[PDB]
Amino acid sequence: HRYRPGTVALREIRRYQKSTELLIRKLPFQRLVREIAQDFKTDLRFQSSAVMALQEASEAYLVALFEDTNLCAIHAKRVTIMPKDIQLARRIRGERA
Amino acid sequence: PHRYRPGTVALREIRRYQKSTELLIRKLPFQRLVREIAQDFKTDLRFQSSAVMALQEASEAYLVALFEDTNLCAIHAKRVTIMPKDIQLARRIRGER
Amino acid sequence: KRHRKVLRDNIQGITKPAIRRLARRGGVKRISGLIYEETRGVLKVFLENVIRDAVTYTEHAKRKTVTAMDVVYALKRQGRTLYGFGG
Amino acid sequence: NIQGITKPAIRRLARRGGVKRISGLIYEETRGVLKVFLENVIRDAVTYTEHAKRKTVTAMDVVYALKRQGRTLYGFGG
Amino acid sequence: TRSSRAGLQFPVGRVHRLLRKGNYAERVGAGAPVYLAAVLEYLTAEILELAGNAARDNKKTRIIPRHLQLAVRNDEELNKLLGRVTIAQGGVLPNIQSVLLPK
Amino acid sequence: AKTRSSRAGLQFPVGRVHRLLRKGNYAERVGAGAPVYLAAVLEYLTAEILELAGNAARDNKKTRIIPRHLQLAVRNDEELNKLLGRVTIAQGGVLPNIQSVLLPK
Amino acid sequence: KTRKESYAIYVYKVLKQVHPDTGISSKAMSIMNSFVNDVFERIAGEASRLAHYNKRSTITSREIQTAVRLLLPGELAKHAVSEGTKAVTKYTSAK
Amino acid sequence: TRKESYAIYVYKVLKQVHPDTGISSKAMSIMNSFVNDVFERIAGEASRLAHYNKRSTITSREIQTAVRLLLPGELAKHAVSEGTKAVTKYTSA
DNA sequence: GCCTATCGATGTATATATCTGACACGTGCCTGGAGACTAGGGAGTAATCCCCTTGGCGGTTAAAACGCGGGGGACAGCGCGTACGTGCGTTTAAGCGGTGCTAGAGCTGTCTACGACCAATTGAGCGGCCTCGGCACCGGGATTCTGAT
DNA sequence: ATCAGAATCCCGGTGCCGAGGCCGCTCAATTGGTCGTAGACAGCTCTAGCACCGCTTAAACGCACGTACGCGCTGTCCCCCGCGTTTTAACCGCCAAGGGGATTACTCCCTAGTCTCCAGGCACGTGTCAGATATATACATCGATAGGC
C-alpha cells in the first residue's frame, strides 16, 4: 500500500513539533562553525557548549523563519514554500536589505 | 472631456508625496486623539506643543513603513490592491500584536 | 441644523484621504475600502503603547505636563528612536 | 561544507516549522540564510574572544553575541 | 537577614551587592533591593507554577526545559515578556494551520 | 594648545567626552585614552554623514543641509542605513521608490 | 578553583512554595537562573536610565516600581507592583 | 538656564568637509541627537565589555572593540584607523 | 488589428522678481576644563597547576543519497461582476489670528535624614561526597487511525 | 459505509546516573558607628499651555458613472512526494597528549581626588542673505481621434 502525498508530511509535522531534540547533525554543523570562524581568526578552539549553543540558536532562528515562510505561502493561497517566500519573510523582519 | 483612468492619478500622487516632508495627518484631530488616549492612563494631563508633533511624526513614520510592507505582501499574492489581510500579515511577521 | 453637530468619534478624525495619503507616501497604487478602519485601530494601538510609556515617564518625575523628552524616551524604549525632537 | 546541512535536515527543520510541502529550491536558500546567520553571530563571538586574550570561544561569548543581536539564549551559561 | 526581615526567600543582600557592583547608579537606596527581590520572587513563582502545571499535565514530576517553554508560550503576558528569548531545548508549541489539514 | 582636543587633533571635545564618561556611570575608572578615541570616532561618523548630506544638498541646488538631505544621505548609503536603519529622522520623508509591478505599460 | 554564585536555592524554595512535591532538572535550573539574571539586568538598566533622566543619582524603590511598570506587561505589572510594595512596607515596619 | 550641545563642533566639521555649505537648526538638532545616540551606544557596549572581563576601566581599547562590534564593516575599519591615529599622536605629546 | 500621426487638456519643470524669517557673526560673561600635586590599588608581569580540547582509532548503526512512479498542486488562461478610482458640486472644519487666564515648569535656598565607608563578627551558602528512585528504554499487545472495498 | 493494516499509544520490567541530602568551611552579609553630601521642602517667578471666538479657505464629504482589478473556474503539466534500495559517515566508546585557561603573588604606574586659575563656550542681540513663494512661461505626459498598412 501507499500513503497519499501529504499525510506522512502531516505525521512528521505532528512528530517533530512534539520533540525537543536537535535536528541538524552535530559534526557537520561543528565543521561549518569552524570553517566560518577561520575567516576571522585562524586556529580558534571552541568549547563544546559554544557549538551546542550556536546550533540551538541556529535551529530556533531557522524554525521561526520557516514559520514566517509558511505564513507567506498561505497568504498566496499555496501550500508549497518557495524561495520568494523566504525572501519576503526575511525582508519584512528587516533581516534582509 | 478629459478623464484620467484608474491608477493614473494615483502614480502622480505617489510621486508628489514621496518627494515631500510634510506631515500628512492633520494636527488638531490627531492632538485630540492623543489626549484621549492619554486620558485613560492618567487624568489631568497636559501636553507641550512639541510632544504631540513628535507623536504624530513617529505615528506616520510607523504607518508609512507598515503600508510599504502591506503593498509588498499584496504584490506577493499577485495583487495590486492592499487589503486588511496584508496588514495583518505584515504585522504578524514583525511580531507586533 | 442650528441645533448641534454629530460630535464625530475622533478616531474617524483620521479621515479617509489622510490614510490614503499615508499609503501613497508608502508607494501604494490601489487601496481597498476596508483598510481604513483597520489602519485606525493599528494607529490607536501604537499610540496607546507609546503614550502609556511616556505618561509613566511623566508621572515618575512628578510632573503634570508630558514633555517631548518623555515621548522620545518612550519611543526609544520600543526601538523607534526619533531624531530631532529632543535628546 | 555548507552542503553538510543535508536536504533531510532542512526538511525536518521545515516540518518543525509547520511546513507541509517544500519546493526544490528552498534548500540552497536555507543554507545561504544559515551561513549569513552564522557569520553574523560568529564575527561577534570571535571579537568578544579576541578582546579577552583567549584562543577558546567560550559559551559565554556566544551567549553575549546572541544577546547583542536581540536573540537571548537561556540555559547555556548566562 | 534582610530576606527574612522582608519576608522573602530571594536574597536581599546579594541583590543589593549586585545593584552596587553593576554601575547602575552612584548610590543605591535601602528599599530598592527589597522591592527588586520581591518582584523577582513573584516572577519566578509565576513561571514555576505554570511549568509545574504543564509537567503535571504531562505526568512529569520534574520540570524540564520543555515544560518551561510550554508554560511561557501558553501564557500571553509571559510570552510578551519572553518574546525574543529562545529557551534552550524547549521546542515549539504544537500548531498546524487549518489550510494544511485535509478537507 | 592647552586643550586636550588640540593635542588629539580633533574638533570634537575631549574634556567634555571624558566628563560625560565619568558622570555617566559607565565604569568606576575611565582611562585617559578612551575620550580621545571616542571623540575621534564620533568626529569621523559626523564628518561622513555631513559630507554625504552636503552632496545631496548640492544636487538639489541648496546651500543649507535640511533634514531631507540627512535622510537621503543616511538611507542611500548601505553602512549608515545599517547603523541608523531602525531610527527615525524627523521631517525626513522617504526615499522615492515605485515598484515595477505598479508602473504602467 | 573558582567560587561561583547562582540563583539555584531560592528558586528551589519558591518551587516548594508553589508545588511542594515537584522537582527541577539541572538544565531547567540553569534556564531559570538565566531568566532571573536577565530580568534583574533589565529592571536595573531601566531604573538606571530613569535615574539619569531626572538628573538623579540614587536608585530607590520608586525607580524600581516605575521600571517594573514600564518593562512588565499589563496584568503582570500589577501583582508584581503590589508584592513589591507589600515587601517594602513590611521591611520598613520591622527593624 | 545653562544647556550644552555639540552644535559648534558639528559646524566646524561641516566647514572642513564642506566649507561653503550651511546647516539649518533642525538639521543641527538631528545631528546632535545622532552624536549623542552613537556616544551612548559605544559607551554602553564598552561598559558591558569591561563588566564581562571582571575589569573596572574603560580604556581606549574597549572603545576600539565596541567600535568593531557596533559600526558596520567599512565604517568600523575606517573609524578604528582614525581613532588609533588620534590616540597615538595624542600620547606622542 | 494595429501604431502613427496629431489634437488641445492638463501637468510638471524652469525662468526672474521681491519679500521675510531664520541663519552667521559678534559681545560679555562664567562655569567647566587644564595644570599642578598627592596616595593607592588596579592591571600587567612571571610562574605554576591541571582541566580540557584536540586528534586518533575502531565498530555499528542510522541516516543520507539515489531512482522510480504518479498524483496532487502550481500555473496560465478565461470570464464575470462587484468594488475602487476619478471628477463634480457642496459643506465642513482645520489653520491662524486674536482674547484672557493661571496652572505648572524651573530656579534658588535651606537642612537633615539617608546613606558611604569602615571594622568586627558570624552563619548563610557553596562544594564534596554520597545515595536512592525515577525515566529512558526495550519489547510485547491493544488501539486507532486509515486506504482502498 | 467497509475491511485489513501500518503507526502511534499503552503497559510492565529493567537500570542507570542525575537530583536531592548531608556535611565542612570561608567569605560575604550583618551589626554598630560616624560623617557628609544630597534631596525633600518651602518659596517665588513667569513661561507657556488651556479654553474660547473670529474669519478665511482649502480639504473633506457625498454622489454619480465607468473601467479594471479581484476572484472563481477549468485544464494542462511537471515536480514534488512516498517507498525501496544501496551507500556513507555520524555516533559512541575509549585512550592520550598538551595547549591554554585559571590561579597565585609581586610590583609599578595610571587614575581618582583636591586645589587653583582662566579661556573656551554658549546666551543674547543682531544684520542680511538663502529660500519660501510666484507666475510666468515653455514643454512635455496622455486619451482620443482615424488614417493607411
Author numbering:
A (entry chain E): 39 to 135
B (entry chain A): 38 to 134
C (entry chain B): 16 to 102
D (entry chain F): 25 to 102
E (entry chain C): 16 to 118
F (entry chain G): 14 to 118
G (entry chain D): 28 to 122
H (entry chain H): 29 to 121
Paper lines:
CHD4, CHD3, and CHD5 form CHD subfamily II, which differs in domain architecture from subfamily I. CHD3, CHD4, and CHD5 contain two N-terminal plant homeodomain (PHD) zinc finger domains, a DNA-interacting double chromodomain, and the ATPase motor. CHD4 is a subunit of the multi-subunit Nucleosome Remodeling Deacetylase (NuRD) complex. CHD4 is implicated in the repression of lineage-specific genes during differentiation and is required for the establishment and maintenance of more compacted chromatin structures.
We obtained a cryo-EM reconstruction of the nucleosome-CHD4 complex at an overall resolution of 3.1 Å (FSC 0.143 criterion). The CHD4 ATPase motor binds the nucleosome at SHL +2. The ATPase motor is in a closed, post-translocated state with AMP-PNP bound in the active site. The PHD finger 2 of CHD4 is located near SHL +0.5 and the double chromodomain. The high resolution of the nucleosome-CHD4 structure shows that ~5 DNA base pairs between SHL +1.5 and SHL +2.5 are pulled away from the octamer surface by up to 3 Å. In contrast to the nucleosome-Chd1 structure, we did not observe unwrapping of nucleosomal DNA from the histone octamer on the second DNA gyre at SHL −6 and −7. The basic side chain of the H4 histone tail residue Arg17 inserts into this acidic cavity.
